Structure formats: C-alpha cells, structure tokens
Design a protein around this ligand. Structure first.
Ligand SMILES: [Fe+3]
Ligand SMILES: [Fe+3]
Ligand SMILES: [Fe+3]
Ligand SMILES: [Fe+3]
Ligand SMILES: [Zn+2]
Lengths: 230, 221
C-alpha cells in the first residue's frame, strides 16, 4: 500500500475496536493512544526507509503464500520479518520495555498490512509487467482510501491460531484471492494505453480489500494484546 | 464528575503542562507540586443547602439570587489571584482548588444542562458519574495533547466556553436510548456512553491545563 495508507489502516482498525468496546479492548485502546507516536514511527520507518536499502529489504515486503515456502538465508520475506517484529514486541512488552515494544508493533503492523495488498501477495513488483503499475496503483489507492473508512457493520476478524506466522499467511491468502481484480488483461491494457479505466475497474475491489484489511488488522491488534496478556 | 474524577482531571492537566514545560511555565509546575495538598483539599471541599447545590450547575444558554457554577467558579478564581498577589499562598492555592472544581464540573454535560440527581430518570446522573470514575483511567493524558486556551481576559468567558463544549455533548450522554437502557436495567448505556465520555474527559483535561496556565499568567502579570 507522502502516501499514508498504512497508518490510515491502523487508524481505521482503532475505530473498529473503539466502536464495540469491551474490557480487554479498553485497555488495549488506552495503550495504542498513549504510544501512538512510537507505533506511527515504526509504521513510517518500515514504510519509507526499509524498502529502499537493498533487494533483501525490498523482498521483505512481499510474501506469496503459495510459493515462499523455505527461507533462503539472507532473503527474509514479509511473513518471516513480520513475525520477527511481532514476537519481539510481545517479549519486550512483557519485560516492560514499552517504548521499544510499541515501536516494533508499528513495524509488525507495516508488514502485516503490506501483504494485505494483492500485488504483495503475488510477487508483483514495480518492475513486473507493466512496469510502473504497482506504484501507480498504490498512489491511486492513497487518493481514494478516504471513501472506505471503517463502518458500523465491521468487526475485528480473527484467524484460528496462536502463532502470528499463520495470521500473516491467512492475511496474504485473502489478498492473493483478490489479485485477479487488480491485475488482469483489462487493467494492464488500460494502464498501458494511458486511460483511467483501470482506476474505475479497481476502485470498488480496492475498497473491499481495504475494508477487509482494516478488519483483519483490528483482529491482529487484539491478538497482539492477547499475546502480551498470556 | 470516593469518586475522584475531579482531582484526576487536575493530575492529567498537570501532566499536559509538565510535558511541554519551558522556563516560563517552570515556576507554576513547582507551585502545583508544593501546594498539591491545598489544591486537592480545595477540590475535595467544593464537592461536599440549595445555594451550594445550584452552584454546581451552569446552563450557558440560560439567564434566582443564587449563584451558578460560572459565578461561583469565577468568584474563587478571581479571589485566588488576589490572594496570590498579596502573598497568601496557602489560601491562594486552596481557592484555586475550589475554582478547579467548579470549572471541571461544567465540563460534565449534565452539569451544563440542568440535569441533576432528581432529573428524570432519577439516579441516572449519579450512575453515570460513578461509571465515569471506574473507566477514566483508560483516558489518561497522552503526548499529543496540548493546553487549550480561550480568547478572553475574563475567567467568566472561560467558564462559559467550557460549559458550551460540554453541553454540545449532552445528547451523547442523555437521550432516548440511554434513558431507556438505564430504566430497563441493562448496561447498554455504559457501552453507548464510553467513547463520548472518553472524548469529553480528554477535552476537559486540555481545557483545564489552559485554565491553569491562564491562572498563572494572571498571578504573575
Ligand atoms: Fe505498502
Ligand atoms: Fe507496494
Ligand atoms: Fe462533579
Ligand atoms: Fe454531578
Ligand atoms: Zn460540584
């Protein structure tokens, strides 16, 4: 996903938690508010710094759940990297290192939301054909995400596992399922010809993907809270 | 708002002032620390006839020989400033505590709209304030907060503006849904009011920090 889609997803997920408050969510919400700056910096650092250091860090933003099986040394994908920061943040929190914990939570949020973008779940990079469509699409999403803010009917979506690796896998699987709505013969030809049909063709599937990502991120934050409270 | 929401608001406002402290604010922070007990007792004493009861309410949209919270809050604030300037610091900070009590009271929407313990449904007022007491700790001061100021040299206008902000939130606290919830005896009103309560508490902390900074400027001018 000055693009701010990742932080925006975090804010929408916070709204989903707040609108249906319960005991544990109230404690989590107070923490997320108090440590917003630390979380925001983690999101930003993964967003605007990490992808551009080399190809190892660039690859860390992608995870194809139907391919990226074995870990080749020095080539961590988004599932491995996201799980690393998530698990370290839980450990730091439980040791009382809150500032670091919430920063690393921000890092984990970036990787988890990155693979909710279908291109990131199917090895479609900025140099995949047609070159430039990846960045054009993400810039476009930034301009229209405000039409798909959290709504009253939404819920936190959870996955059935105590292991965050599986949350990352399942979030990417859902995104990959939407890849044909974003990258297809029609949108690729539209982007090459230079008309805006790809924008009209992808806006509603983008809105559904963003609204799903908000909900799975709300569940992910609740899961983070559960792990810290174990 | 042993319910301690009023003192809690003062402690949150103190945190807001402390995090953005500079040399011009530094003396006030030490004063608040040195006179915490006097301020706390001023807040506590205001909490406990008809003159004293009416004095905790101020509907800013309405016009008795009896003082409302704007008049009583301004009385103690202005006296506190005078006492400070005459060197009567123990008394100055005690009356500051009284003034803090009246100012934070009308940051509570019911107090800004004549909704008392006997207003219908009777008992909802105290049920709400007791509930707020139990959940305020989820809305403590955060680093994004600031002291909020109003454009006036007259504390009466600060009291008016604080009450107007509270009154705008009254429909979020007292409405057909919450009143029916409280009457039927389920807890739905708690779920419906928690987020507006959190927003009200966060605004009140910030306007109180501005109020303390404003008081300090008056004492040092
Ligand atoms: Fe991204
Ligand atoms: Fe991308
Ligand atoms: Fe009160
Ligand atoms: Fe009251
Ligand atoms: Zn009172």
């Amino acid at each position: 996903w000055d693009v701010n889609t990742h932080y925006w997803l975090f804010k929408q997920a916070e709204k989903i938690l707040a609108k249906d408050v319960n005991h544990m969510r109230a404690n989590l919400m107070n923490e997320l508010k108090k440590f917003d700056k630390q979380i925001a910096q983690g999101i930003y650092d993964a967003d605007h710094k990490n992808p551009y250091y080399d190809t190892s860090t660039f690859l860390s933003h992608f995870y194809n759940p139907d391919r990226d099986n074995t870990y080749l040394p020095g080539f961590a994908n988004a599932k491995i990297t996201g799980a690393k920061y998530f698990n370290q943040s839980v450990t730091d929190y439980r040791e009382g290192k809150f500032d670091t914990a919430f920063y690393k939570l921000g890092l984990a949020i970036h990787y988890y939301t990155d693979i909710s973008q279908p291109m990131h779940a199917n090895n479609f990079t900025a140099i995949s054909y047609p070159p430039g469509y990846h960045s054009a699409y993400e810039n476009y999403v930034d301009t229209i995400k405000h039409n798909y803010q959290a709504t009253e009917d939404m819920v936190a979506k959870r996955f059935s596992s105590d292991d965050v690796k599986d949350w990352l896998y399942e979030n990417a699987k859902r995104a990959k399922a939407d890849y044909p709505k974003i990258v297809n013969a029609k949108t690729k030809k539209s982007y090459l010809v230079g008309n805006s049909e790809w924008k009209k063709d992808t806006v509603e599937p983008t809105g559904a993907r963003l609204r799903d990502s908000q909900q799975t991120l709300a569940g992910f934050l609740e899961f983070w809270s559960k792990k810290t409270n174990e």
